[PDB]
Design an enzyme around this catalytic site. Structure first.
Site, PDB file in Angstrom:
ATOM      1  N   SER A  16       0.850  -1.208   0.000  1.00 56.54           N
ATOM      2  CA  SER A  16       0.000   0.000   0.000  1.00 56.54           C
ATOM      3  C   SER A  16       0.870   1.236   0.000  1.00 56.54           C
ATOM      4  CB  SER A  16      -0.984  -0.079   1.182  1.00 56.54           C
ATOM      5  OG  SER A  16      -0.226  -0.113   2.416  1.00 56.54           O
ATOM      6  N   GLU A  18       1.003   5.627   0.747  1.00 52.03           N
ATOM      7  CA  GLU A  18       0.352   6.820   1.312  1.00 52.03           C
ATOM      8  C   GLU A  18       1.104   7.999   0.797  1.00 52.03           C
ATOM      9  OE1 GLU A  18      -0.145   6.695   5.520  1.00 52.03           O
ATOM     10  OE2 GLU A  18       0.270   8.880   5.613  1.00 52.03           O
ATOM     11  N   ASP A 109      -2.916  14.887  14.018  1.00 51.10           N
ATOM     12  CA  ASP A 109      -1.886  15.764  14.572  1.00 51.10           C
ATOM     13  C   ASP A 109      -2.554  17.055  15.031  1.00 51.10           C
ATOM     14  OD1 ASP A 109       0.500  14.174  14.094  1.00 51.10           O
ATOM     15  OD2 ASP A 109       0.543  14.873  12.021  1.00 51.10           O
ATOM     16  N   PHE A 220      11.282  12.689  12.332  1.00 52.75           N
ATOM     17  CA  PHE A 220      11.173  11.217  12.595  1.00 52.75           C
ATOM     18  C   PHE A 220      11.343  10.874  14.078  1.00 52.75           C
ATOM     19  CE2 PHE A 220      10.474  10.457   8.290  1.00 52.75           C
ATOM     20  CZ  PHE A 220      11.578  10.074   7.502  1.00 52.75           C
ATOM     21  N   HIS A 270       3.377  -0.978   4.001  1.00 57.38           N
ATOM     22  CA  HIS A 270       2.699   0.265   3.680  1.00 57.38           C
ATOM     23  C   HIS A 270       3.824   1.298   3.506  1.00 57.38           C
ATOM     24  CE1 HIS A 270      -0.412   3.322   3.988  1.00 57.38           C
ATOM     25  NE2 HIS A 270       0.350   3.983   4.830  1.00 57.38           N
TER      26      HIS A 270
END
Ligand SMILES: Cc1cc2nc3c(=O)[nH]c(=O)nc-3n(C[C@H](O)[C@H](O)[C@H](O)COP(=O)(O)OP(=O)(O)OC[C@H]3O[C@@H](n4cnc5c(N)ncnc54)[C@H](O)[C@@H]3O)c2cc1C
Lengths: 292, 275
Positions: A16, A18, A109, A220, A270
């Site tokens: 997948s 994003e 967020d 990150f 993903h």
């Protein structure tokens, strides 16, 4: 197709992707040209991330319909931050009436450059409340995913509390989870083992984002809460201003991560992909999954 | 202590040891001299891989050294009453930890280990702790990883408290087995079994071993240094060290080392790990 059913078939790993909201109309058309090319790959599902706190709400519904129009399977990201319970329910309805069958229920967020989440005063506080909403209002008409944090949400106070909140969110009615990105596979496998001891059996898809620039690390580590393993971190910070060497480093590290994950028979991978970046394409080519 | 209790109460990963058995009186004494040496390490439990008269005596001897024996019981080559008899003798000796087996890793009447697990529980309930073997790489000559996992689920449901795996050299296959188990709703502790590749290769010369896939880079490293046993040893040790460092980072509840008394391999592995 519902993701729960795609997973249930046990037809080998689900891949997948994003993507991020396009900046302007030419970028939007560029992104949809990219999704059109992607159909050849037969991704399991594709999404574009949600919330400029709400959004882009009508935009995100339109993008899901456009993804479906291409014969791709959209996963709609749906957040609770910045919105009343009633606004959340309205947007949910708009996705389902548009034919979206797959929802990723998220807290969301806070707004840009703000670090601390504060709920909308008539809004939900936790993604598990949105999961319960969806299940009560739609049942099995949709398949619902949630986020999982193998290294823990930065805001949780221990891995074990974090696990206990994850179990509660699964029990609210998740069919699968997708992890926050991580760079040390052992922390993903260790999360899987905590989850197994806690009797959580749902499919948990690892999320992977190759490092493409040195400036990503602060997002990150501080925002996503992912650790950077020592050998990788060393290389990156000796090469920050060779963006060519940072990219090749990030690609190599992601290739080796995903190879181990696929050999461990994960239910799928993903990929978090910057709209223009060729990092993900390079990873897939080097793994034998896409033509050179 | 019962292994299931040692596991719930652990302050860190548990380390255990399984010695391949001796061939002669000389090797018998050296093994127990190694076992006494081992007391300083505080191993969670110790055992000796699969003649059964001597098995009970060995368990009493291990107890006598202040170590916690995990006694092995197999269904292979014996009647049901004989099996229950060896069982009674173990438990009368104060053994509280039993490993119910058909095949006994690293090696490759009741028919199924599950039947022995079920017999133990019928006779002793929860007053003993029972483990079984797990095969992260299955029996691919024979069935399908899915059929293999169904058989494991049945064995667990017969009443296992924990499992210890057959040795592996590719950690991904151990993680993949745990993931299959998770998806099957198996939540019991499952300890990874490790044997430095040297030892395994040595062992395979002498007897039939259970299969363990050797990954590409290791198989190639072995072949280049193919003659130069101190090279090959070192490669084995380095590979086992990296395996274990990743296993511990992945929160395994312990690591189970299969060892030839005998070889310096496992000693070196523990040493480099800082144990
Ligand atoms: C695959 C993925 C996609 C994402 N897509 C988006 C996106 O499109 N838009 C966006 O803004 N963000 C997105 N995010 C980011 C996510 O919104 C943030 O990381 C957010 O901080 C946490 O979201 P959540 O859904 O896990 O929170 P929640 O599950 O609601 O958890 C938030 C905090 O509350 C705790 N908690 C949960 N339940 C309880 C309880 N009942 N009592 C006390 N504490 C509890 C949790 O442990 C955690 O610390 C995504 C994240 C992932 C991993």
């Amino acid at each position: 197709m519902k993701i729960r059913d795609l997973l249930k078939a046990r037809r080998g790993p689900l891949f997948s992707f994003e993507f991020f909201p396009p900046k302007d109309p030419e970028g939007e058309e560029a992104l949809f040209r990219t999704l059109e090319e992607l159909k050849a790959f037969r991704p399991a599902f594709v999404s574009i991330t949600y919330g400029a706190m709400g959004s882009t709400r009508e935009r995100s519904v339109a993008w899901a319909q456009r993804i479906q129009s291409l014969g791709l399977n959209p996963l709609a990201h749906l957040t609770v931050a910045g919105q009343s319970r009633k606004e959340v329910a309205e947007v949910l309805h708009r996705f389902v009436e548009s034919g979206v069958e797959n929802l990723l229920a998220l807290r969301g967020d806070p707004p840009r450059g703000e670090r601390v989440f504060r709920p909308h005063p008539e809004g939900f506080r936790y993604a598990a409340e949105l999961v319960a909403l969806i299940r009560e209002r739609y049942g099995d008409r949709v398949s619902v995913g949630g986020a999982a944090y193998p290294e823990g949400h930065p805001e949780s106070e221990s891995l074990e509390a974090d696990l206990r909140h994850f179990k509660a969110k699964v029990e609210a009615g998740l069919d699968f989870a997708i992890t926050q990105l991580f760079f040390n596979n052992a922390h993903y496998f260790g999360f899987l083992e905590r989850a197994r001891r806690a009797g959580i059996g749902i499919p948990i898809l690892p999320g992977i984002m190759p490092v493409t620039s040195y400036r990503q690390l602060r997002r990150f580590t501080e925002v996503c809460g992912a650790s950077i393993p020592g050998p990788l971190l060393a290389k990156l910070e000796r090469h920050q201003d060779d963006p060519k060497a940072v990219l090749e480093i990030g690609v190599e590290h992601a290739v080796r991560q995903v190879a181990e994950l696929l050999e461990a028979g994960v239910e799928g991978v993903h990929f978090y992909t910057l709209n223009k970046s060729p990092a993900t394409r390079m990873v897939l080519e080097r793994l034998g999954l896409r033509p050179a």
